[PDB]
Design a protein around this ligand. Structure first.
Ligand SMILES: [Mg+2]
Lengths: 102, 105
């Protein structure tokens, strides 16, 4: 075409290459949400739900099992040790009540 | 105009636009980096703070304060479910302790 078209169109390819890299970056940024939902589920949700279910089983009268994940180094481990304290208190109380029967 | 080369006149004419593109890309990278500290703050307020409060309450109950108020029972997420489980556990232990106290009289 004319000089203005020859010069201006010569940068179109480069601009598309810049856009391709920006599209890859935007797609990678978007992925963070679903990956963070998965990490939260495995790291936090499942252990919290497991601990709540264990607390319910203990409150219902099942004292045979030590509370799982007491050795975990984060706040979930601190919580699991606290629930273990309740389980041990309930176990002592139940054993003393059994010694009082008949 | 002191410019001696058309290649320099044309190529320099887009420098301002290119620097703007780069500055916006630097601002995007800086905004992305801010996500980490924000996510540590969200996790602390949403999860850490109530979990530690629940663990402290569980300890107080195990130590003998059977009347300790279990916080966050009205919460709509899994922390609320956990809090309600600790409340049922407090009720069960309270009954167990009172039953023993009465049996030994
Ligand atoms: Mg018997």
């Amino acid at each position: 075409e004319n000089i203005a078209s020859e010069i201006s169109k010569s940068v179109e390819g480069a601009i598309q290459q810049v856009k391709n890299l920006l599209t890859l970056a935007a797609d990678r940024a978007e992925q963070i949400v679903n990956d963070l939902a998965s990490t939260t589920t495995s790291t936090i949700t499942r252990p919290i739900i497991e601990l709540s279910n264990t607390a319910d089983k203990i409150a219902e009268g099942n004292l045979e099992a030590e509370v799982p994940h007491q050795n975990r180094a984060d706040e979930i481990g601190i919580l699991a040790k606290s629930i273990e304290r309740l389980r041990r208190s309930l176990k002592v109380a139940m054993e003393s009540l059994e010694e009082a029967l008949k």
